[PDB]
């Protein structure tokens, strides 16, 4: 029931690039909500997969920022927050580079 | 070579230097804001000592020569060029000595037998009478006082820097007063910059030549990763498109141009010998081979070739035009001594932008000839490596009549062709530190402008002080201006890389109205002016982004390539063919064009594009992987005409025979609607009336005034024949909100295109899909936009005969030829051959599509969702036997559609004569139908592992149908959707029709999703009803006992003892509104309120029931009621602990504490919902889910993993 | 770096078979510490074994008491709080049987 950190980023970096081109976003004042979804909709939902993603490299156990942490008895939920603020700020990273690279992809 | 020491010092060392001229510079009196600004402060005359910020007197002629300079400039601009230079001056000296070039012989930066001393201090006066024979006695009498080691140190090196300025004038210049000002000092301590240049590189490392091309790249490395993404100013160019070629494409090039003619005139030249990447020219036809030997001259005298890179960098790719031309003069037969001055004076000519890759460039060719000739500076030896020069700063009329050249003066002479072609030229070079060597001349002005370089190379050195220093200035722009106007034998380089949106106002321009067929990038710029560079028979060969074979902004190019140029071989190379580059953003190709055409011409080509860089010098140097099987005119035959040499041959030949794709459906693109998350909506989202479905329940006419929402075929993911029928946007009154949406200004916004076709029955493909393509079946009442582009017929055989296609690997084989990328739009596809209509696909296509239908109408986000697939067997059965029933049902479908596909592809395969081996058939894996677990879980690769994942998502699917009906939105009395539009509308009058009358539909709905059953109308409790009311009280318990088995294999982890119905309960509490989040795609229709994270009261709510007075009976009903149970049973618990002792006692303290922490979160639950219950709030369906789950704070579960934004609490 | 939430429950049970007799615990009212410390001290330490535990049988990923969860950035932490309750909670149920057996271990 393996399934790595890196694997979660790549979809979730495919998610952004997709989601800056089906909504023509140009400059980083727009960008947030694309990077939110592509982070969310890359978490793994078993279990077993989600324990497997934490084991890796590219993500640690101590958060960043306590409001993207639920306070909540659901630890799943947790592990599951911690692997969302950990893609969100990876992608944030990459930004002006998929900006250049959607602006850049036209030529026309 | 350990370039590490060198790529890690020379981008410090870059800084180093910076600094130190800057800290220079504050005493000079020059400085500029913490943005950049200069200042100057006149200077203050203190007898004969000017005191700027303290420098003598005479020190201020050429420090305002230096106030000029910056003034014109910059600050930031200076630094870069001055620290680089001097950094280019020492690294020389650092160079010369290790090699001993220098006439005195000691090491002149460092010491052998001192790892921190520097020779030239023991040895005062052996270094003062070699370079300063008059000043002995003076610097002798200095280091005998012991003390001033830094002031003789300095003495000496300028002593040796003008000595260096007769045989390499582009680097050490003498009355160069201006330079030696930012010489800095410290060069003697413990911390002088030179110590890194010593400590920092190895001597190993000095040995070779091509470090001069790593110090090149590595200096300005830092630079570089600032000035990328942005558009790049004139002054950071060199910079942004700086690399360094590996040495074996180099030799490619150079001996398949350079070499390539000298063996045209005399063949049996041994030069092959050397050239291990010669080529050899594929058998031409003996008509081609006889038009080749009436075009090559009989004899070439080795000094008349001549060769230009107009980008040469480090001058890397010179130095093997150098060892080209060198084995040239000594097959021909020249003294050892004699070859240098033959070859820089007459062959080799070099340009750049680059001031600075200038004189690096010189300085390698220069010791390339030290290195065969001890004697080559001593003669006056003139490079053509100059750097291009602008002249917005030349006093015009002060150089013509100090020149004096027809001698008037013992303005006359403005009607004398000097004048007259001396103005000609400036103009041409206005911004040539921008347009670089793109500024044609033409080839008559070649004598006139050479004649008159001569002539004033002449009073250069015949002139007095006046002449002299007058045409010193004017030679930098006659030269590179005749350079220019020369037509050369062959052009080699490798040219700059920057897209147009790094390209600069005054660059864009002259690109358009220069490069029309090229303004694209700067790489295709270079390679069509190359041309107009070569003789009739001269060569053009560069290395270059691979894009120009294959795009489509480049056919108008490509096409006068093939027409009036001749391909002789290319190495197609791909990506990191570079080893000091990281990322995807660089795919390469190396080539050969002759500047003549011959249609019937062979080329060679080497599909290289596998492995890293050491891979393919392997596979080169081996002939490995050759296409010589295709001529120029072949690639003619292709649409587009893309360099395509890696195709087969009945491939190409299908081309000429059928018909195009395009010819025969019309490939229409989509609207733009100019905002995806205002007018677009999931078909779920919104109500059920105001979409243009059309239900199976709704009989009661369509209002088109009523209609808001429009189905629209937006892409989406892989699908080979009819689904992702999803997404509906907002066409109300034919559009009136998308067509007058506007920006602020006025502009229009959306573009409406092809709307005339909407609402029409067509076949519809994903423009943006990341691995192959496919169409979909694409019935009436259906709009689409650009991610969804879509082809219509007329003929309804036609547009299934291309459907049945255009799903087929067999286009995906002719979609790899035309275009290799992500983006399938309408431009590639329409060339697509097309062959007549045979009707046993257009029979295969329909079984083909109903079976896609079927998959995709299987699930509940399909408007043409039933009911599910559960329903369809015999309710007395096992349930777990009927799973059985289902996973047999669901791969015999598999094979029905592969089948289906197969004998398409082949059949298509027979009619356009293609070969089976290269076009693969479909797998298994390949089936685009949910009900295939090969294609549905491409993760998971195993077999017990892949059963278990299945049976999850089955046992999900029948959950969310049983909530479903709970919810009123489907029945098992009626068949298909049954309740979804605003505001809990009607469905009273359902209730009275008998429409649930089987499976009640709550009261309220609101499900409270608790993990006790409190109510009765509880989630848990009326899923237990399901399965007693349709697969019976006989098999409730078999039946109930297997959901438990199946939720507890993937979705969670077992529990001992944990029956099956608190198993049931367990999951949907936990588990179940995360499956349903990813369910909708994070747009839930059963909202999940929660009262915290305790789990003190959550509840599941249908979207569409929702109305004013919903929180309020969520409040009366349930918060309240349950309130005063969790009060009536926390006092009969504080009787419980008391009475126990033993382990009993502790057992039942813990369920006391477990209960009431869940009274005070419910109790701030409930103040919280006190207050948005007094509000009211009502919801419009039409905003959308993301907009609508944050008008409600926290009360709500996941609001910022749904609506992106943290909850607005109150 | 496997690790079972079994073998965990081991050590803590031998923990508090221990514990028990070297304080002559004898009535529940006074189990209680004996039973917290031996389930922290078989807690794992590193964050390759304590996710290893949570994959396992016997342990589930909601708590059952907010105030044994740190609320807390560090879901080191946090899985390593869900260890310790899930191991105290099966130890009780053992408690009666224990205190019998150590009772019932001297008979003298
Ligand atoms: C050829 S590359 C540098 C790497 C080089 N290939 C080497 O072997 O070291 C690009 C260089 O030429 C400059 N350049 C840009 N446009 C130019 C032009 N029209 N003519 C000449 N050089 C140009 C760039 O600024 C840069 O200095």
Redesign the pocket.
């Known amino acids: 029931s393996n399934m790595t950190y890196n694997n979660v980023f790549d979809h979730a970096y495919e998610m952004l690039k997709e989601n800056i081109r089906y909504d023509d976003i140009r400059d980083t004042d727009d960008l947030h909500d694309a990077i939110h979804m592509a982070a969310d909709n890359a978490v793994p939902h078993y279990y077993a997969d989600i324990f497997s993603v934490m084991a890796s490299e590219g993500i640690d156990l101590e958060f960043e920022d306590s409001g993207l942490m639920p306070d909540t008895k659901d630890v799943i939920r947790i592990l599951q927050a911690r692997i969302y603020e950990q893609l969100t700020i990876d992608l944030w990273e990459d930004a002006e580079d998929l900006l250049n690279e959607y602006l850049e992809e036209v030529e026309e | 070579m350990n370039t590490n020491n060198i790529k890690k010092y020379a981008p410090q060392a870059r800084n180093q230097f910076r600094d130190a001229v800057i800290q220079k510079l504050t005493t000079l009196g020059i400085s500029a804001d913490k943005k950049g600004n200069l200042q100057i402060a006149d200077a203050e005359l203190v007898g004969e000592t000017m005191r700027y910020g303290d420098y003598p007197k005479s020190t201020l002629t050429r420090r305002d020569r230096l106030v000029k300079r910056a003034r014109e400039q910059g600050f930031d601009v200076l630094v870069e060029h001055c620290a680089y230079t001097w950094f280019n001056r020492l690294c020389a000296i650092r160079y010369m000595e290790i090699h001993g070039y220098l006439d005195h012989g000691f090491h002149m930066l460092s010491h052998p037998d001192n790892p921190t001393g520097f020779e030239v201090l023991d040895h005062v006066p052996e270094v003062a009478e070699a370079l300063l024979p008059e000043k002995k006695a003076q610097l002798v009498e200095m280091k005998l006082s012991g003390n001033q080691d830094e002031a003789i140190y300095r003495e000496l090196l300028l002593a040796q820097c003008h000595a260096l300025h007769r045989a390499m004038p582009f680097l050490f210049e003498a009355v160069d007063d201006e330079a030696e000002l930012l010489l800095p000092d410290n060069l003697t301590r413990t911390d002088s910059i030179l110590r890194g240049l010593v400590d920092g590189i190895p001597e190993e490392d000095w040995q070779e030549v091509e470090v001069i091309?790593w110090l090149?790249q590595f200096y300005i490395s830092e630079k570089k990763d600032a000035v990328i993404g942005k558009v790049v100013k004139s002054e950071d160019?060199?910079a942004a498109?700086?690399?360094?070629?590996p040495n074996w494409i180099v030799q490619y090039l150079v001996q398949n141009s350079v070499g390539r003619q000298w063996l045209q005139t005399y063949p049996d030249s041994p030069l092959k010998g050397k050239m291990d990447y010669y080529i050899e020219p594929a058998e031409q036809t003996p008509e081609v081979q006889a038009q080749l030997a009436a075009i090559t001259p009989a004899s070439i005298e080795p000094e008349s070739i001549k060769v230009l890179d107009?980008?040469?960098?480090?001058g890397?790719?010179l130095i093997e035009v150098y060892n080209v031309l060198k084995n040239i003069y000594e097959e021909r037969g020249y003294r050892a001594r004699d070859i240098p001055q033959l070859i820089l004076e007459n062959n080799i000519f070099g340009?750049?932008?680059?001031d600075r890759?200038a004189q690096l460039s010189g300085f390698a060719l220069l010791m390339m000839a030290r290195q065969d000739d001890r004697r080559i500076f001593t003669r006056d030896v003139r490079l053509n490596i100059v750097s291009?020069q602008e002249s917005l700063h030349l006093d015009i009329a002060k150089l013509w009549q100090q020149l004096n050249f027809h001698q008037q003066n013992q303005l006359a002479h403005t009607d004398s062709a000097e004048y007259q072609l001396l103005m000609r030229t400036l103009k041409r070079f206005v911004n040539a530190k921008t347009?670089?060597?793109?500024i044609q001349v033409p080839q008559e002005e070649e004598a006139e402008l050479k004649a008159f370089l001569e002539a004033l190379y002449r009073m250069e050195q015949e002139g007095d002080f006046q002449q002299k220093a007058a045409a010193k200035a004017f030679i930098p722009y006659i030269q590179q201006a005749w350079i220019l106007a020369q037509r050369y034998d062959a052009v080699v380089?490798?040219?700059?890389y920057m897209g147009g949106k790094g390209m600069n106002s005054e660059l864009k321009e002259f690109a358009k109205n220069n490069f029309p067929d090229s303004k694209a990038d700067?790489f295709a710029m270079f390679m069509q002016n190359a041309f107009s560079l070569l003789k009739e028979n001269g060569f053009n060969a560069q290395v270059n982004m691979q894009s120009w074979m294959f795009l489509s902004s480049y056919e108008a190019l490509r096409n006068w390539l093939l027409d009036n140029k001749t391909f002789i071989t290319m190495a197609h190379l791909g990506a990191r063919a570079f080893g000091q580059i990281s990322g995807e953003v660089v795919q390469t190709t190396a080539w050969v064009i002759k500047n003549q055409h011959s249609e019937r011409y062979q080329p060679v080509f080497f599909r290289l594009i596998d492995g890293r860089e050491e891979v393919k010098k392997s596979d080169l140097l081996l002939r490995k992987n050759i296409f010589d099987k295709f001529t120029q005119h072949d690639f003619k035959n292709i649409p587009g005409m893309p360099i395509a040499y890696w195709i087969d041959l009945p491939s190409l030949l299908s081309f000429r025979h059928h018909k195009k794709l395009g010819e025969k459906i019309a490939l229409k693109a989509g609207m733009s609607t100019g905002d995806n998350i205002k007018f677009q909506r999931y078909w779920y989202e919104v109500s059920i009336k105001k979409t243009l479905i059309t239900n199976k329940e709704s009989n009661t006419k369509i209002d088109i005034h009523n209609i808001k929402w429009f189905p629209c075929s937006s892409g989406g993911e892989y699908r080979k024949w009819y689904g992702n029928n999803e997404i509906v946007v907002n066409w109300e009154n034919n559009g009136y909100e998308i067509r007058n949406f506007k920006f602020e200004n006025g502009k229009t916004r959306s573009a409406v295109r092809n709307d005339e076709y909407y609402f029409r029955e067509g076949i519809t493909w994903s423009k943006i899909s990341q691995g192959n393509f496919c169409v979909r079946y694409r019935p009436k009442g259906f709009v689409f936009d650009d991610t969804g582009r879509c082809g219509f017929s007329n003929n309804k055989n036609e547009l299934l005969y291309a459907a049945g296609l255009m799903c087929t690997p067999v286009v995906n084989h002719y979609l790899s030829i035309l275009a290799p990328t992500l983006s399938f739009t309408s431009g590639e596809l329409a060339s697509v051959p097309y062959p007549e209509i045979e009707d046993e696909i257009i029979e295969l296509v329909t079984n083909a599509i109903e079976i896609a239908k079927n998959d995709w109408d299987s699930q509940e986000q399909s408007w043409d969702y039933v009911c599910s697939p559960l329903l369809e067997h015999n309710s007395t059965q096992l349930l777990r036997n009927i799973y059985k029933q289902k996973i047999n049902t669901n791969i015999k479908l598999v094979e029905t559609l592969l089948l289906i596909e197969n004998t398409i592809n082949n059949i298509f395969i027979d009619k356009l004569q293609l070969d089976k081996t290269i076009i693969k058939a479909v797998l298994q894996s390949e089936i685009t139908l949910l009900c295939n677990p090969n294609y549905r879980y491409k993760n998971i690769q195993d077999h017990t592992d892949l059963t278990n994942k299945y049976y999850t998502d089955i046992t999900i699917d029948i959950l969310s149908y049983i909530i479903g009906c709970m919810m009123g939105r489907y029945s098992l009395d009626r068949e298909g959707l049954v309740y979804a539009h605003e505001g809990n509308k009607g469905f009273a009058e359902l209730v009275a029709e008998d429409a649930y009358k089987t499976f009640p539909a709550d009261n309220d709905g609101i499900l409270p999703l608790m993990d006790d059953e409190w109510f009765d109308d509880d989630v848990t409790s009326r899923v237990k009803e399901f399965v007693r009311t349709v697969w019976g009280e006989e098999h409730l318990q078999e039946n109930l006992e297997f959901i438990a088995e199946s939720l507890c294999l993937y979705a969670i982890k077992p529990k001992k003892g944990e029956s099956a119905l608190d198993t049931i309960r367990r999951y949907l509490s936990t588990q179940f509104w995360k499956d349903h989040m990813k369910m909708y795609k994070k747009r839930p229709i059963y909202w999940l309120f929660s009262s915290g994270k305790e789990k003190a009261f959550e509840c599941l709510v249908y979207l569409h029931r929702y109305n004013d007075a919903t929180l309020a009976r969520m409040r009366t009903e349930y918060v309240v009621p349950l309130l005063a149970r969790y009060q009536a049973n926390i006092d009969r618990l504080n009787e419980q602990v008391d009475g126990a002792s033993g382990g009993e006692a502790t057992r039942l303290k813990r369920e006391r504490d477990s209960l009431s922490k869940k009274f005070n979160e419910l109790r701030s639950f409930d103040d919280r919902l006190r207050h948005y219950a007094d509000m009211r709030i009502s919801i419009d369906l039409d905003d959308g889910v993301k907009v609508n789950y944050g008008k409600f704070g926290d009360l709500l579960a996941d609001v910022k993993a749904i609506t992106g934004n943290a909850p607005e609490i109150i």
Do not use: E, K
């Not at chain 2, 498109?241 to 070629?245: E, K, N, P, S």
């Not at chain 2, 340009?351 to 680059?354: A, R, T, V």
């Open positions: 091309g090149y160019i060199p498109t700086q690399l360094f070629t107009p980008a040469c960098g480090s890397h790719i340009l750049d932008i680059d890759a291009l347009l670089g060597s793109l380089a490798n040219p700059p700067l």
